[PDB]
């Protein structure tokens, strides 16, 4: 299996630098070029440039020749992209891809350029109100408020509850994010079979689990 | 200007 | 730069349909053109290279053609799994360029939301905040309006809404709406109402509680 495995999401202060990795496996690293691509939600993909690990030649889009440095380490089979003098415009997801034809892509690395402070989330359980009216399904929820940066990872029952989940995109207000997640479950299985939301925030090295209990 | 995949 | 001009920007079609999209080169030159599929949050996957060659493991429901400098991607027997964004790649002249993308939506029968309202949690109230959460789940089409009422009077300030991408199993949409108050204001009122309506229609779906 050809695979390109990129480094984690990063929060970087404006003006600072970031180095992103792309570990290639399943093919001989020195026989294919590696290309790098920028994706922002409203802009559509931009080509940054490429390196050939064979001779370590590089080419750049003129838009990025000053900001990007592509390198490679054949002993670890890793390609790198260094981005310098970062600004809010550089916030995006960056992909590596194999060959000019780009037949295999890494999973992307989300870079956030911002001077706001890393902040762990408050996690609040959402159980039906005490005056609830019952039918065959119950919907429960988790409210995740006041964190920075993204991403947060939310699962239910450590991943074993997967059907009937809606985890909504976070919305940024006053430099803090809020998101919510709902899970819908057969009404006869709660609370007898517990449901717990789990919220991991790697930027703050924090994980919070909240079991959903009925209101008094 | 023209890209060519290395041999 | 040899740019690729892509249209349409979005596409809504039924299961079983045939759908098309195009990229037009910005100069009269021969180029090698690829098509990709990208699902939300995922890596692109190569479908077609060299205008018409099918990538291994891709269904022949996908095909590409070239007419001059107009390149076309065609998808037959549309399936739920085809819901995605599609884009082209010019990989002959440096710098390489991409089309701006075509987002492909699947039609289905209209469906009213399942609405659920949640009062603030006790832990949040201890910190002085009071968020009322309303989920509007598994509805179609995507256009829907949420209205909040406090003791019967409409309220706009402090409302945050968020929408999921189209669900890949049933082609519905869901949305979350959160009215965030201070505890001070939340304790001064009693009835909190979340109302789901759509364009033109006058009969909303209503969930509410009393503190």
Residue numbers in the entry:
A (entry chain H): 1 to 52, 52a, 53 to 82, 82a, 82b, 82c, 83 to 98, 101 to 214
B (entry chain P): 392 to 398
C (entry chain L): 1 to 211
What does the original paper state about this entry?
Tau is a microtubule-associated protein that supports axonal outgrowth and stability along with transportation of vesicles and organelles in central nervous system (CNS) neurons. Functionally, tau coordinates its microtubule attachment through dynamic phosphorylation, which negatively regulates tau’s ability to promote microtubule assembly. Structurally, tau is a soluble and largely unstructured protein that utilizes its flexibility to remain accessible to kinase and phosphatase attachment. Under pathological conditions, hyperphosphorylated tau (pTau) aggregates into oligomers which can assemble into twisted ribbons, straight filaments, and paired helical filaments (PHFs) and sequentially into neurofibrillary tau tangles (NFTs).
We determined a crystal structure of mAb C5.2, which is a novel antibody that targets the pS396 tau epitope region, in complex with a phosphorylated peptide. Our structure is the first one of a tau Ser396 phosphorylation state-specific antibody (PSSA) and herein we reveal the atomic details of its pTau recognition.
